[PDB]
CSV table of C-alpha atoms and ligand atoms in Angstrom, one decimal:
chain,number,residue,atom,x,y,z
A,1,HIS,CA,0.1,-0.2,0.1
A,2,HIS,CA,2.0,3.0,-1.7
A,3,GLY,CA,-1.1,5.6,-1.6
A,4,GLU,CA,-3.8,5.8,-4.1
A,5,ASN,CA,-6.3,8.9,-5.1
A,6,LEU,CA,-10.1,7.5,-4.5
A,7,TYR,CA,-11.5,10.5,-6.2
A,8,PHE,CA,-9.1,11.0,-10.4
A,9,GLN,CA,-9.7,13.7,-11.2
A,10,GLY,CA,-10.3,14.4,-15.3
A,11,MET,CA,-7.7,15.5,-18.2
A,12,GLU,CA,-10.4,16.8,-20.0
A,13,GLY,CA,-10.0,20.3,-22.0
A,14,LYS,CA,-6.0,19.3,-22.9
A,15,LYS,CA,-4.9,21.2,-25.8
A,16,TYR,CA,-3.5,18.3,-28.4
A,17,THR,CA,-1.0,19.8,-31.1
A,18,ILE,CA,-2.4,18.5,-34.7
A,19,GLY,CA,-0.7,18.6,-38.0
A,20,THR,CA,-2.0,18.4,-40.9
A,21,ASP,CA,-1.1,19.7,-45.4
A,22,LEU,CA,-0.6,22.5,-46.3
A,23,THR,CA,-3.6,22.4,-49.1
A,24,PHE,CA,-5.3,19.4,-49.7
A,25,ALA,CA,-8.9,20.6,-50.5
A,26,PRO,CA,-10.9,19.7,-49.8
A,27,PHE,CA,-9.7,18.2,-46.8
A,28,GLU,CA,-8.0,21.1,-45.4
A,29,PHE,CA,-7.0,24.9,-47.5
A,30,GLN,CA,-7.7,28.1,-46.4
A,31,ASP,CA,-10.0,30.4,-47.3
A,32,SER,CA,-9.1,34.3,-48.4
A,33,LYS,CA,-8.4,35.5,-44.7
A,34,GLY,CA,-5.8,32.7,-44.2
A,35,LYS,CA,-8.2,30.8,-42.0
A,36,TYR,CA,-7.7,26.8,-42.5
A,37,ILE,CA,-11.0,25.5,-43.9
A,38,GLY,CA,-11.9,21.9,-45.1
A,39,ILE,CA,-14.0,18.4,-44.6
A,40,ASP,CA,-10.8,17.5,-42.5
A,41,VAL,CA,-10.5,20.3,-40.3
A,42,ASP,CA,-14.7,20.9,-39.7
A,43,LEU,CA,-14.5,17.0,-38.3
A,44,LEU,CA,-12.0,17.5,-36.4
A,45,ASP,CA,-13.3,20.6,-34.7
A,46,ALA,CA,-16.6,19.3,-34.2
A,47,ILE,CA,-15.4,16.1,-32.5
A,48,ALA,CA,-12.6,18.0,-30.9
A,49,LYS,CA,-16.2,20.2,-29.3
A,50,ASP,CA,-17.9,16.5,-29.1
A,51,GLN,CA,-15.5,15.4,-27.4
A,52,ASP,CA,-14.5,18.4,-24.2
A,53,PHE,CA,-10.5,18.9,-26.2
A,54,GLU,CA,-8.9,21.3,-27.7
A,55,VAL,CA,-6.9,22.0,-31.3
A,56,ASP,CA,-3.6,23.5,-32.0
A,57,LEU,CA,-3.5,23.2,-35.5
A,58,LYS,CA,0.6,23.5,-37.1
A,59,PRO,CA,0.3,23.7,-41.4
A,60,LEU,CA,3.1,21.7,-42.0
A,61,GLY,CA,2.8,19.5,-45.1
A,62,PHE,CA,2.0,16.0,-45.3
A,63,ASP,CA,5.5,14.5,-45.1
A,64,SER,CA,7.0,17.0,-42.7
A,65,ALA,CA,3.8,15.8,-39.9
A,66,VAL,CA,4.3,12.9,-40.6
A,67,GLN,CA,8.4,13.0,-39.6
A,68,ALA,CA,7.0,15.7,-36.6
A,69,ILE,CA,5.1,12.8,-35.4
A,70,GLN,CA,8.0,10.3,-35.4
A,71,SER,CA,10.1,12.9,-33.4
A,72,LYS,CA,7.4,13.2,-31.2
A,73,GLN,CA,7.1,16.9,-31.8
A,74,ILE,CA,2.9,16.9,-32.3
A,75,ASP,CA,0.7,14.7,-30.5
A,76,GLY,CA,-1.6,14.0,-33.4
A,77,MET,CA,-2.2,14.8,-37.8
A,78,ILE,CA,-4.9,14.7,-39.8
A,79,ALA,CA,-4.1,15.6,-43.4
A,80,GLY,CA,-6.0,13.2,-45.2
A,81,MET,CA,-4.0,10.1,-44.1
A,82,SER,CA,-4.1,7.1,-45.8
A,83,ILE,CA,-3.8,4.0,-43.4
A,84,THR,CA,-1.3,1.5,-45.0
A,85,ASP,CA,-0.5,-2.2,-42.9
A,86,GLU,CA,2.7,-0.6,-42.9
A,87,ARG,CA,2.7,3.1,-41.6
A,88,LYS,CA,0.7,0.6,-38.4
A,89,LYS,CA,4.0,-0.5,-37.9
A,90,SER,CA,4.6,3.1,-36.7
A,91,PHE,CA,1.4,5.1,-36.6
A,92,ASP,CA,-2.0,4.3,-34.4
A,93,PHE,CA,-4.2,5.2,-36.4
A,94,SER,CA,-8.4,6.2,-35.6
A,95,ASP,CA,-11.4,4.1,-37.5
A,96,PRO,CA,-11.6,5.1,-41.5
A,97,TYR,CA,-13.2,8.3,-42.6
A,98,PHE,CA,-12.7,8.7,-46.2
A,99,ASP,CA,-12.4,6.2,-48.7
A,100,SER,CA,-10.1,7.4,-51.2
A,101,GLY,CA,-7.1,6.1,-53.7
A,102,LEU,CA,-4.8,7.7,-56.4
A,103,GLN,CA,-5.2,8.7,-60.0
A,104,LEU,CA,-3.5,9.6,-62.5
A,105,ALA,CA,-3.7,13.5,-63.8
A,106,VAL,CA,-1.9,15.2,-66.8
A,107,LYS,CA,-2.4,18.9,-68.1
A,108,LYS,CA,-6.3,20.3,-70.1
A,109,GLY,CA,-5.7,19.2,-73.3
A,110,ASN,CA,-2.9,17.1,-73.5
A,111,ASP,CA,-3.7,14.4,-76.3
A,112,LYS,CA,-1.0,12.2,-76.0
A,113,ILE,CA,-1.2,10.7,-72.6
A,114,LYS,CA,-4.8,9.0,-72.2
A,115,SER,CA,-3.9,5.9,-70.4
A,116,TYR,CA,-1.1,4.1,-67.9
A,117,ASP,CA,1.2,2.4,-71.3
A,118,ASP,CA,1.2,6.4,-72.3
A,119,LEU,CA,3.9,7.0,-69.4
A,120,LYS,CA,6.4,6.0,-71.4
A,121,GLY,CA,9.2,8.2,-71.9
A,122,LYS,CA,7.2,10.8,-69.6
A,123,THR,CA,7.3,12.2,-66.8
A,124,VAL,CA,5.6,11.9,-63.6
A,125,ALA,CA,5.4,13.8,-60.7
A,126,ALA,CA,3.9,13.4,-57.0
A,127,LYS,CA,4.3,14.4,-53.1
A,128,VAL,CA,6.8,13.5,-51.3
A,129,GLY,CA,6.4,10.3,-48.4
A,130,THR,CA,2.6,9.8,-49.7
A,131,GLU,CA,1.2,6.9,-51.6
A,132,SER,CA,1.0,9.0,-54.9
A,133,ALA,CA,5.2,9.1,-54.2
A,134,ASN,CA,4.8,5.1,-53.2
A,135,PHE,CA,3.1,3.6,-56.2
A,136,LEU,CA,5.3,6.0,-58.8
A,137,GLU,CA,8.4,4.1,-57.6
A,138,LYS,CA,6.1,0.8,-58.0
A,139,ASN,CA,5.6,0.7,-60.8
A,140,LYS,CA,8.6,3.1,-62.6
A,141,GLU,CA,10.0,0.1,-64.8
A,142,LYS,CA,6.1,-1.5,-65.4
A,143,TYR,CA,5.1,2.0,-67.6
A,144,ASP,CA,9.2,2.9,-68.2
A,145,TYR,CA,8.9,6.8,-66.6
A,146,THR,CA,10.8,9.3,-64.9
A,147,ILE,CA,10.3,9.9,-61.7
A,148,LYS,CA,9.9,13.7,-59.7
A,149,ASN,CA,8.7,14.5,-55.8
A,150,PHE,CA,7.7,17.8,-54.9
A,151,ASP,CA,7.4,19.1,-51.1
A,152,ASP,CA,3.3,20.1,-51.3
A,153,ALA,CA,0.7,20.4,-53.5
A,154,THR,CA,2.0,24.3,-54.9
A,155,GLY,CA,5.6,22.2,-56.0
A,156,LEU,CA,2.9,19.4,-58.0
A,157,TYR,CA,0.8,20.8,-59.2
A,158,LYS,CA,2.9,23.8,-61.4
A,159,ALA,CA,5.0,20.9,-62.9
A,160,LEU,CA,2.4,20.5,-65.2
A,161,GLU,CA,2.6,24.0,-66.6
A,162,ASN,CA,6.5,24.4,-66.3
A,163,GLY,CA,7.7,21.6,-68.3
A,164,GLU,CA,8.9,20.0,-65.2
A,165,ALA,CA,6.1,16.9,-65.3
A,166,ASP,CA,4.1,15.5,-68.5
A,167,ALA,CA,1.3,14.5,-65.4
A,168,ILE,CA,0.6,13.6,-61.9
A,169,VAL,CA,-0.5,11.3,-59.5
A,170,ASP,CA,-2.6,12.7,-56.6
A,171,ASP,CA,-5.4,11.0,-54.5
A,172,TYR,CA,-8.7,10.8,-56.3
A,173,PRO,CA,-11.2,13.2,-54.2
A,174,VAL,CA,-8.6,15.5,-54.6
A,175,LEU,CA,-8.0,15.5,-57.7
A,176,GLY,CA,-11.7,15.8,-58.8
A,177,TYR,CA,-12.6,18.9,-56.9
A,178,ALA,CA,-10.0,20.5,-58.2
A,179,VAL,CA,-11.0,19.1,-61.6
A,180,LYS,CA,-14.0,21.1,-60.6
A,181,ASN,CA,-12.1,24.1,-59.2
A,182,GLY,CA,-11.3,24.8,-62.7
A,183,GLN,CA,-8.1,23.8,-63.0
A,184,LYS,CA,-6.5,22.7,-66.2
A,185,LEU,CA,-6.6,18.9,-65.7
A,186,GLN,CA,-7.4,16.0,-67.6
A,187,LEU,CA,-8.2,12.9,-65.5
A,188,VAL,CA,-6.3,9.4,-67.2
A,189,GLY,CA,-7.8,6.1,-66.2
A,190,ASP,CA,-9.2,5.5,-63.0
A,191,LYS,CA,-8.9,5.0,-58.8
A,192,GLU,CA,-6.1,2.8,-58.0
A,193,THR,CA,-4.6,1.9,-54.2
A,194,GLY,CA,-7.4,2.1,-52.5
A,195,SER,CA,-7.3,3.1,-49.6
A,196,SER,CA,-9.8,4.7,-46.6
A,197,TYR,CA,-8.3,7.9,-44.3
A,198,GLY,CA,-7.5,8.4,-40.6
A,199,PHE,CA,-6.3,10.3,-37.3
A,200,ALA,CA,-3.1,9.4,-36.8
A,201,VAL,CA,-0.7,9.2,-33.9
A,202,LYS,CA,2.3,7.8,-32.7
A,203,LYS,CA,2.3,4.3,-32.7
A,204,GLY,CA,1.9,3.8,-29.1
A,205,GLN,CA,1.4,6.9,-28.2
A,206,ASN,CA,-1.8,9.4,-27.0
A,207,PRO,CA,-4.2,5.9,-26.8
A,208,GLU,CA,-7.0,8.2,-25.4
A,209,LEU,CA,-6.4,11.4,-28.2
A,210,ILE,CA,-7.3,8.3,-30.2
A,211,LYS,CA,-10.2,6.5,-27.8
A,212,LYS,CA,-11.4,10.4,-28.1
A,213,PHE,CA,-11.4,10.9,-31.8
A,214,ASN,CA,-13.5,7.2,-32.4
A,215,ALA,CA,-16.2,8.0,-30.1
A,216,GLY,CA,-16.4,11.6,-31.3
A,217,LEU,CA,-15.9,10.3,-35.2
A,218,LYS,CA,-19.0,7.7,-34.2
A,219,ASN,CA,-21.6,10.4,-32.6
A,220,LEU,CA,-21.3,12.9,-35.7
A,221,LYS,CA,-22.2,9.9,-37.9
A,222,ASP,CA,-25.4,9.1,-36.0
A,223,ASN,CA,-26.1,12.7,-35.3
A,224,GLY,CA,-25.9,13.3,-39.2
A,225,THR,CA,-23.6,15.9,-38.6
A,226,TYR,CA,-20.9,13.8,-40.7
A,227,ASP,CA,-22.7,13.9,-43.6
A,228,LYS,CA,-23.8,17.6,-43.8
A,229,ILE,CA,-20.1,18.1,-43.4
A,230,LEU,CA,-18.8,16.1,-46.2
A,231,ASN,CA,-22.3,17.8,-48.2
A,232,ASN,CA,-20.9,21.1,-47.9
A,233,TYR,CA,-17.7,20.1,-49.8
A,234,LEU,CA,-18.8,18.1,-52.4
A,235,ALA,CA,-22.2,17.8,-53.2
B,1,LIG,N1,-1.8,14.8,-48.0
B,1,LIG,C1,-1.4,13.9,-48.4
B,1,LIG,O1,-1.2,13.8,-50.0
B,1,LIG,C2,-1.7,12.4,-48.7
B,1,LIG,C3,-2.1,11.7,-49.1
B,1,LIG,C4,-2.3,10.6,-49.0
B,1,LIG,N2,-3.4,9.9,-48.9
B,1,LIG,C5,-1.2,9.4,-48.6
B,1,LIG,O2,-1.8,9.2,-46.9
B,1,LIG,O3,-0.2,9.6,-48.4
């Protein structure tokens, strides 16, 4: 008998540092005054209010956020992040909150690329550290292209216009949203490499944050707010 408090005081109201991507619409992006908005931002904020925690959002970029989690610089991340078996070796994920995949894209009007078989001799780009980048490595010899990587979306999308790349790979719902946003894109082929998005923490860390995210997510699904948030961007 070394002592025990029979009146636990809850850790409610805890403020967590949460990393996210710089721009990854419709999941996170900024409005005209620089405020972060998007499906991920809204889901997280609604969950945080439901579960009585606070968020300090740290826009870092995708790979930068991944490395910040592993370096214990931030508590969690939400960044349209695919749950994968390999990532589960170093991250703990929430329940899934979106079904996604990858999409090949070229500049609008580029009739020279209508299939993956048309990538021979071309340069194809993706964002560093992403499922798209991994897909490019896996398929490089198969379709005989050269790879470029960019740190974030700004470089990746500029690449189709400035001579750097003939094609890019990015997430399917992001490219669909970009086409609807009037960007000069042509989508090629269908969804590849299905995955679902989760909130993430470093493996073995912040288990309460995962528990709260999962509870909040279920509550938003049950009460209709999940569906409304998605429709606010995807309708
Ligand atoms: N924000 C992103 O670019 C994420 C891309 C992809 N879903 C991944 O998890 O790698």
